[PDB]
């Protein structure tokens, strides 16, 4: 309203140029603020430009020097501590060059990430989806970073960090914000740390998006990828995102069948398990592990990785095709490989039923094992979804979790049908 107007003056001050055809709005958007087309936009049309000096990063913030200087102290699993300190500093800075930008940020106490859910609810609603595992790892990292890194740094530089921002709760909120709002610029291998991109982080996300960001030497450009008719919301793409990643990172899901990018994971060791399960002999077991290790050498499998199954195609395609090949090939045919490229080809809805019986059976069994890791079967969730009035009576978190579980089980069950 006024914050929007203030933000737009700020844009002009810092050289951020919006097309007259786009409008920042809170009306008719899928969530919070979004951008809407004032006039129909053509594919390839420039929607806005953000100068690189307008970005909020460890490098542009007012303590960029101190942060760079202390880059070793500030290391972590995520690599976000420097950005989080820039944000923490800028938020308590009286004359922050980014105030009008912060004014459009969401209310930090109302973030929807499952990390803020009661632990039993998260654990129970999202079992088998991979979310509880990811959140648990996040929470551990967030807590260790705050105590051993972020809090002692702030206390070492009280001038730069008022007491009101020395907050564990706040640190959780800013991590969530970085997760949901930040951009990471692709390289070209030391991955670029995330930055906050004003205006660009106003756009909501869809699998079927109509805008995307381009990087250039001096600026970022948001460009239309599809024609956008008058009055229609402009949707960026946050990536090829399954619902389990959307809810974890962004606190939302796309309702079935909207998410054409949804996926289900089959843990790599589950495939191994299926292979072991089929053995009759302690000798047969050990020949399984030999095939496993060979795949670990090819870097096709690993103890904590997963195969990623898409709606029309397997995404970790060569990993899986090669895993099936090796685990299933005649024991003689294997010894000559273990002595003397990998397996090409697509794994799609049409291809899978044409695979060898042995590949399909191993896959079938792996999927059965995977489906057993959820609390209920697909029929239960399919029933909660099919009845709109039953669905409507579920809490918001229950609806979200349902969409995640349902999307995953459907893909798994489709794979079950394809492997007969």
């Amino acid at each position: 309203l006024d914050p929007v107007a203030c933000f737009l003056s700020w844009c002009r001050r810092v050289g951020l140029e919006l097309s007259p055809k786009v409008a920042v709005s809170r009306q008719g958007t899928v969530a919070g603020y979004g951008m809407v087309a004032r006039e129909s936009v053509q594919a390839g049309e420039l929607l806005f430009v953000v100068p690189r000096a307008a970005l909020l990063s460890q490098h542009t913030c007012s303590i960029g020097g101190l942060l760079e200087r202390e880059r070793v102290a500030l290391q972590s699993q995520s690599g976000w501590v420097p950005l989080l300190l820039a944000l923490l500093h800028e938020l308590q800075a009286p004359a922050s060059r980014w105030r009008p930008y912060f004014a459009l940020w969401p209310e930090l106490g109302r973030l929807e990430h499952p990390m803020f859910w009661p632990e039993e609810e998260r654990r129970c609603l999202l079992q088998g989806t991979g979310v509880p595992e990811a959140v648990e790892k996040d929470l551990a990292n967030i807590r260790s970073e705050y105590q051993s890194i972020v809090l002692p740094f702030m206390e070492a530089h009280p001038d730069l960090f008022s007491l009101r921002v020395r907050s564990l709760e706040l640190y959780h909120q800013l991590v969530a914000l970085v997760m949901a709002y930040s951009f990471q610029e692709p390289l070209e291998k030391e991955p670029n740390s995330p930055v906050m991109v004003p205006a660009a982080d106003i756009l909501n996300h869809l699998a079927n998006h109509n805008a995307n960001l381009e990087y250039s030497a001096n600026c970022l450009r948001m460009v239309a990828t599809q024609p956008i008719p008058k009055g229609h919301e402009i949707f960026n793409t946050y990536g090829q995102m399954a619902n389990w990643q959307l809810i974890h990172m962004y606190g939302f899901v796309e309702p079935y069948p909207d998410n054409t990018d949804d996926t289900a994971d089959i843990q790599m060791v589950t495939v191994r398990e299926a292979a072991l399960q089929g053995t009759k002999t302690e000798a047969e077991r050990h020949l399984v592990y030999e095939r496993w290790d060979f795949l670990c050498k090819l870097e096709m499998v690993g103890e904590e990785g997963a195969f990623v199954i898409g709606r029309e195609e397997v995404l970790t395609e060569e990993e899986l095709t090669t895993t099936l090949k090796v685990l299933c090939m005649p024991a003689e045919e294997f010894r000559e490989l273990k002595d003397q490229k990998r397996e090409e080809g697509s794994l799609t809805i049409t291809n899978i039923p044409k695979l060898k019986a042995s590949w399909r059976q191993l896959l079938q069994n792996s999927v059965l094992l995977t489906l057993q890791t959820y609390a209920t079967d697909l029929k239960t969730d399919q029933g909660l979804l099919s009845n709109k009035e039953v669905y409507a009576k579920l809490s918001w978190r229950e609806q979200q979790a349902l969409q995640v579980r349902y999307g995953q089980k459907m893909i798994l069950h489709q794979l079950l049908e394809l492997t007969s």
Partner: peptide, 6 residues
Amino acid sequence: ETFKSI
């Protein structure tokens, strides 16, 4: 490493 790349 900050996730949303575009």
